[PDB]
């Protein structure tokens, strides 16, 4: 009626499930999760871009005493250079002799590429589970994607799906992550506007489109240009340049758990940890009765080759004699060997040479031939290959 099982939550596993209704016929379903999605609760705190110090117009009081100004901006500064004797391209800038002053006023400013400057200090909240899995039941292999927590239905081919939650949260979420313009960098977000000198976060933007920005980078004006109209204004290095310079590894560079990291929104594709509770709401009317199918009996299970490898190494014949022709299910009634097919066409007194992938060398695989049992034997020798690409059985 309802088949609740746990598939091994891994990318690309042929998750076989034998829905055998008692007094129905044998039913089998082969589903595989293509992608799981970890979607965290992003909560932006620091806005990260390089801070550009806007130096003002030169306050050359030529032949005149300097006056103070309280530049109450982010990093405003007024400095008095006594001895204002600047000369310019039209000549000497002061017609007065020696009593000129240089008021040097320098303020801070955000990045003019601040739209391109995407430093997102997403203080991460909880994670969301989304999953897309294909399913092959009723002779049909079709995909279904959903918010994979188990609080929203999937319904495909008359088959309900309660997918999710996962087992654990060891995922690519850190505590307060940083979107470094496409990158996931797990970082220590500083005091929001009260950041330390020169680190990643010198110009902290408490709003990503805000107007207040904490920038204490030591933008200090030196003594002025000696006879030249120049405001020497020494500031700290590019902390946004440094954190972009020291970008480090991304999520793909930092994949724990075999994790695959994606951005905007940060998606945890291939969170290879935990098993998936999948509940197929089987529509029971499609479940054909036990008298309905061909009556498979008098079978022999002969392992033609036993090669303990990742591939379907035990390819064994089942000389079976069905009651009538039809598509009878091949169910892995044993624990180890996965049947390469799912339901083979049994036409009559013939041999179905189906393959099973296992690892155990002395293999006795018990299989259900649509109602029947067969415990076949195989000496699974070690395969000659060393390293493969895929996963195995």
């Amino acid at each position: 009626y309802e088949h609740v099982t746990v598939i091994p939550n891994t990318v690309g596993v042929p998750y076989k499930t034998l829905v055998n209704r008692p007094g129905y016929s044998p039913m089998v379903l082969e589903m595989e999760l293509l992608s799981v999605t970890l979607e965290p609760t992003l909560s932006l705190d620091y806005i990260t871009c390089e801070y550009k110090t806007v130096i003002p117009s030169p306050y050359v009081k030529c032949c005149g005493t300097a006056e103070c100004k309280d530049k109450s901006l982010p990093d405003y500064s007024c400095k008095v250079f006594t001895g204002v004797y600047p000369f310019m391209w039209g000549g000497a800038y002061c017609f007065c002799d020696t009593e000129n002053t240089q008021l040097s006023e320098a303020h801070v400013e955000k990045s003019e590429s601040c739209k391109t400057e995407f430093a997102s200090a997403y203080r991460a909240h909880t994670a969301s589970a989304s999953a897309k899995l294909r399913v092959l039941y009723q002779g049909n292999n079709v995909t279904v994607s959903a918010y994979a927590n188990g609080d929203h239905a999937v319904t495909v081919k008359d088959a309900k799906f309660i997918v999710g939650p996962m087992s654990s949260a060891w995922t690519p979420f850190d505590n307060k992550i940083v979107v470094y313009k496409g990158d996931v960098y797990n970082m220590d977000y500083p005091p929001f506007g009260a950041g330390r000198p020169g680190q990643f976060g010198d110009i902290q933007s408490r709003t990503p489109e805000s107007e207040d920005v904490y920038a204490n980078t030591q933008l200090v004006l030196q003594r002025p240009s000696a006879g030249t109209v120049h405001v020497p204004y020494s500031q700290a290095p590019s902390g946004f340049k440094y954190w972009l310079k020291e970008r480090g590894a991304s999520l793909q560079h930092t994949a724990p758990f075999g994790c695959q990291i994606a951005t905007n929104p940060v998606r945890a594709m291939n969170c290879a940890v935990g098993n998936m509770p999948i509940s197929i709401d089987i529509p029971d009317a499609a479940f054909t009765r036990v008298v309905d199918a061909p009556s498979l009996t008098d079978m022999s299970c002969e392992v033609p080759a036993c090669t303990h490898s990742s591939d379907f190494g035990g390819v064994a014949i089942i000389k079976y004699a069905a009651s009538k022709k039809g598509k009878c299910a091949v169910h892995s009634m044993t624990n180890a060997v996965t049947i390469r097919e799912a339901e083979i066409e049994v036409e009559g007194n013939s041999q179905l040479q189906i393959s099973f992938s296992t690892a155990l060398a002395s293999a006795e695989f018990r299989v259900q031939v649509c109602s029947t049992q067969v415990h076949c034997a195989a000496e699974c020798h070690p395969p000659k290959d060393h390293i493969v690409n895929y996963p195995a059985s």
Partner: protein, 48 residues
């Protein structure tokens, strides 16, 4: 080019490469994903 194990402890080593190189990747229990340059990196899984 970086390498890292295919499980929880990745151990994601990485080296910028300049010359001809012979990388001796260790077959992990979860295998070894290596991205050498700009393609999707190969994931070694050792058959017994």
């Amino acid at each position: 080019l970086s390498y890292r194990n295919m499980g929880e402890e990745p151990n994601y080593q990485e080296e910028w490469v300049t010359h001809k190189k012979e990388v001796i990747r260790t077959v992990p229990t979860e295998g070894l994903e290596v991205t050498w340059g700009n393609n999707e990196p190969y994931k070694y899984w050792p058959q017994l």
